[PDB]
Amino acid sequence: VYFIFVVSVVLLVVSTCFAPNFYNILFFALWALNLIYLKFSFRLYRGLAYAFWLTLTFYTSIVIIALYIYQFPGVSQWIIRNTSLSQEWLNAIGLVDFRAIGESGALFLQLLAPIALFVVTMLQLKFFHGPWSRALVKKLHKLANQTIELLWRFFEVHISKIVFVIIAIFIANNINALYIPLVILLSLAICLPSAADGIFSLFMCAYLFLVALSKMGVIVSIIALAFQSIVIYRQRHYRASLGLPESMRAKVFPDFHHSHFDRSLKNAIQFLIDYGFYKFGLEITMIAIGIDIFNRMDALAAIQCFWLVLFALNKRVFVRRIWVFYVIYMAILYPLQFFSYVGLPPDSCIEYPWSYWIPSYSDDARFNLSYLLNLSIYGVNWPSAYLIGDFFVLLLASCQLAVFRREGEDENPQYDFIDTKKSYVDYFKSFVFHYGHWITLMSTLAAGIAGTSLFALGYIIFTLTMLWSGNNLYVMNSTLRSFEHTLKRWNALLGYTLFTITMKVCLQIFGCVFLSWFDQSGGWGKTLCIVRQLFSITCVNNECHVLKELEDFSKACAVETKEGNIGFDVIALSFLVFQIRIFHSWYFQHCMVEYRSEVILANRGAVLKNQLIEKEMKEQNEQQKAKFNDIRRR
Amino acid sequence: DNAELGMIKPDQLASLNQALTDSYTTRDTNSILRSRMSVSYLKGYTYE
Numbered sequence: 001v002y003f004i005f006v007v008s009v010v011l012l013v014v015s016t017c018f019a020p021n022f023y024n025i026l027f028f029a030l031w032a033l034n035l036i037y038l039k040f041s042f043r044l045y046r047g048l049a050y051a052f053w054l055t056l057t058f059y060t061s062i063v064i065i066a067l068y069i070y071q072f073p074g075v076s077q078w079i080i081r082n083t084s085l086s087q088e089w090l091n092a093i094g095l096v097d098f099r100a101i102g103e104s105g106a107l108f109l110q111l112l113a114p115i116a117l118f119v120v121t122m123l124q125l126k127f128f129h130g131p132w133s134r135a136l137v138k139k140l141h142k143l144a145n146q147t148i149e150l151l152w153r154f155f156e157v158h159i160s161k162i163v164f165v166i167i168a169i170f171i172a173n174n175i176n177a178l179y180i181p182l183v184i185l186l187s188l189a190i191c192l193p194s195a196a197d198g199i200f201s202l203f204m205c206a207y208l209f210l211v212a213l214s215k216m217g218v219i220v221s222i223i224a225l226a227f228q229s230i231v232i233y234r235q236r237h238y239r240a241s242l243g244l245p246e247s248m249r250a251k252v253f254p255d256f257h258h259s260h261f262d263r264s265l266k267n268a269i270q271f272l273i274d275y276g277f278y279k280f281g282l283e284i285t286m287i288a289i290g291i292d293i294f295n296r297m298d299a300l301a302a303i304q305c306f307w308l309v310l311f312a313l314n315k316r317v318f319v320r321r322i323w324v325f326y327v328i329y330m331a332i333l334y335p336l337q338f339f340s341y342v343g344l345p346p347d348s349c350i351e352y353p354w355s356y357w358i359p360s361y362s363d364d365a366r367f368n369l370s371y372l373l374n375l376s377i378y379g380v381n382w383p384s385a386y387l388i389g390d391f392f393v394l395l396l397a398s399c400q401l402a403v404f405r406r407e408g409e410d411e412n413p414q415y416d417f418i419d420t421k422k423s424y425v426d427y428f429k430s431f432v433f434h435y436g437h438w439i440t441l442m443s444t445l446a447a448g449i450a451g452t453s454l455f456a457l458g459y460i461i462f463t464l465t466m467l468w469s470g471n472n473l474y475v476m477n478s479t480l481r482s483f484e485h486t487l488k489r490w491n492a493l494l495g496y497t498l499f500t501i502t503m504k505v506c507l508q509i510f511g512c513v514f515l516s517w518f519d520q521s522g523g524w525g526k527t528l529c530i531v532r533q534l535f536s537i538t539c540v541n542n543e544c545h546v547l548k549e550l551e552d553f554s555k556a557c558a559v560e561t562k563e564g565n566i567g568f569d570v571i572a573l574s575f576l577v578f579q580i581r582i583f584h585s586w587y588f589q590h591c592m593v594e595y596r597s598e599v600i601l602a603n604r605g606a607v608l609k610n611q612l613i614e615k616e617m618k619e620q621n622e623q624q625k626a627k628f629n630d631i632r633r634r
Numbered sequence: 635d636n637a638e639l640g641m642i643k644p645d646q647l648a649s650l651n652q653a654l655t656d657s658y659t660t661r662d663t664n665s666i667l668r669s670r671m672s673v674s675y676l677k678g679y680t681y682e
Contacts, residue, residue, distance in 0.1 A: 551659070551660075554660045555660060558660075559660065561660065
């Protein structure tokens with residue numbers, strides 16, 4: 001069943017484990033066409049089975065006999081004289097006399113390897129093509145089968161997504177000419193559904209082939225998408241083997257009836273995250289963009305800065321369609337962003353008029369500005385964080401976009417549930433949710449206090465005023481003030497966080513702009529300093545230079561050099577907006593109302609119970625000391 | 635007391651100590667650590 005895989009390895013290995021030559025690059029090409037034909041279809045599988053039957057083997061054998069007869073002395077010169085072939089072209093062919101070099105150890109390697117591949121491929125051809133093309137040890141076997149099935153299910157779920165990531169860190173690592181027409185088609189792949197998955201994948205196999213031919217790590221990608229097509233075919237084959245429907249079902253098997261997830265631990269565990277479906281997409285993308293803001297810290301990120309603001313201050317059903325525009329407004333930004341990134345791979349001879357528009361300030365400032373607007377500059381070496389961040393947010397947006405296309409939605413907290421008071425997993429989740437509105441939501445605000453800013457004082461005063469009033473507010477259910485209070489919270493801990501994070505990029509670009517706007521004698525910028533002691537200040541990015549005058553001004557200004565919002569602002573915003581779309585409905589309202597009655601209750605009732613029980617304790621300890629004195633005495 | 639082998643006036647020590655601190659640059663932290671170590675070493679000896 002799997003010695004075809006052992007074969008695979010060998011052909012590729014022999015062709016690829018020595019200096020390249022015509023024989024070697026011809027075999028590589030034949031391997032690539034074999035993989036492409038497998039990608040084309042499974043009747044093409046049957047046809048390639050017919051293939052091995054007639055090819056590569058005869059070409060491997062005739063090449064072996066040709067090199068063997070060439071290895072003889074004397075016949076080399078005779079052939080050279082007859083065919084008028086140059087020695088350099090013969091070396092490019094690969095047909096070189098090894099005895100004249102004296103390296104006898106070279107001969108036996110390619111006298112044992114092609115013969116071994118020949119014999120193993122005949123053994124495979126005459127054996128495998130029949131049956132393969134026709135189609136508490138016991139407890140340990142059952143467990144192994146169960147794990148195999150589970151990992152196969154997870155693979156067919158999430159190998160389609162993996163082929164995107166394993167192909168993008170490669171292009172992110174190395175960028176050249178032979179990658180420009182690839183990535184654009186990549187941008188044309190996820191932006192379209194699976195209906196063209198068979199075609200666009202072929203578009204991959206056609207191009208990464210040619211670039212390899214341009215050479216004279218990529219093979220990891222080749223085996224990656226080959227394995228993707230392999231599991232695509234094998235899942236259908238397995239389904240047809242057991243008389244199962246051939247439809248590609250997104251849901252593997254409803255074990256805990258989705259919403260019956262509560263079931264228990266391993267019971268929820270899965271759809272707990274498997275049906276993450278909604279939770280996943282929405283909240284995690286609002287977090288992917290947030291973590292992307294740190295990875296970028298440039299003006300290109302300022303455009304997407306407000307697109308999340310467009311989502312966070314309106315209901316989901318209110319801006320349902322505009323976000324469909326948003327997911328395509330980034331599906332086309334990645335391609336021309338990369339197009340600019342490359343620009344001219346080896347070199348060229350042409351100028352830039354943006355620099356010409358700019359004149360009379362400083363040379364360092366235009367470099368910093370060009371870095372911030374993120375467009376091309378000759379010879380600048382860029383990191384790979386931006387590409388990965390944009391790639392991850394694009395995938396999350398596309399997933400959530402498929403969610404929205406699957407189904408959408410057509411005066412109060414609409415959604416509601418039922419009670420059973422706790423359940424291990426929920427016991428845990430319910431217990432942490434009861435206190436989540438107090439410490440989990442506000443520890444991030446405490447981090448904001450640690451954020452050492454004047455806007456941090458803005459957090460400070462608000463949270464200090466909120467700690468006294470909101471506690472009594474929630475536990476009493478103010479009539480005709482629930483929605484009013486929650487809108488107050490919206491403007492309070494949701495509006496302020498985004499409102500103070502929106503400048504976190506343009507204030508630093510202001511600090512990075514045309515060198516100086518602050519440093520002379522008398523009386524202007526000591527008060528333009530009192531504000532620049534905390535407003536514009538760090539303008540921090542790990543690529544910049546300064547001149548002497550701004551070097552002295554910064555020496556005078558004494559900036560701490562740590563103000564990036566990654567530490568305390570984004571991880572607070574993300575928690576707040578992970579909460580916003582969840583606690584506005586569901587059990588929250590149930591528990592919120594559970595907070596009011598209990599007041600009257602334990603307020604005037606267990607108080608007398610408590611005084612009474614303390615006197616009761618007194619009585620028992622009293623009697624025990626009486627008894628011990630008696631007994632000591634007795 | 636003679637010029638050939640003389641002591642160090644507090645003026646020169648103060649000037650050198652002031653010079654030690656200002657050689658850094660705002661961004662680099664290695665300069666911060668270097669100035670810290672150098673001033674700590676220098677201040678361990680009195681003018682005597």
